[PDB]
Amino acid sequence: QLCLQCRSNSDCNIIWRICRDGCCNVI
Q1: Degrees, nearest 5: CA angle 26-10-27
Q2: Measured over all CA atoms, what is the biggest interatomic distance in the chain, rounded to whole angstroms?
Q3: Exposed e or buried b for every residue in 7-22, given b needs 16+ CB within 10 A?
Q4: How many whole angstroms separate alpha carbon 10 and alpha carbon 16?
Q5: Contact present, 24 and 17 (Cβ < 8 Å)
Q6: Distances 21 to 8, 17, 27 between C-alpha atoms, Å
Q7: Sign of the four-CA dihedral 13, 10, 12, 21
Q8: Three-class SS string for the chain?
Q9: Cβ atoms 6, 21 nearer than 8 A
Q10: Contact between 18 and 1 (Cβ < 8 Å)
Q11: 25 phi and psi, to 5 degrees?
Q12: Residue spans per domain, the chain
């Protein structure tokens, strides 16, 4: 559970590209 503050869809890295509840998900 790494709620990485996201923005658009994959505003994080190659790992987390699922900008879920304001966070980046790897799913």
Answers
A1: 20
A2: 19
A3: eeeeebeeebbebeee
A4: 6
A5: yes
A6: 11, 12, 13
A7: negative
A8: CCCEECCCCCCCCCCCCEEECCEEECC
A9: no
A10: no
A11: -120, 150
A12: 1-27
Q: Would you give the distance in Å from CA 23 to the centre of its chain?
A: 5
**Measured distance CA(25)–CA(1) in Å, rounded:** 8
Please classify residue 24 by burial: count the beta carbons closer than 10 Å to its beta carbon, then call 0-12 exposed, 13-18 middle and 19+ buried: buried
Determination technique used: NMR
Position of tokens 């923005």?
7
- Per-residue tokens: 11: 């505003």
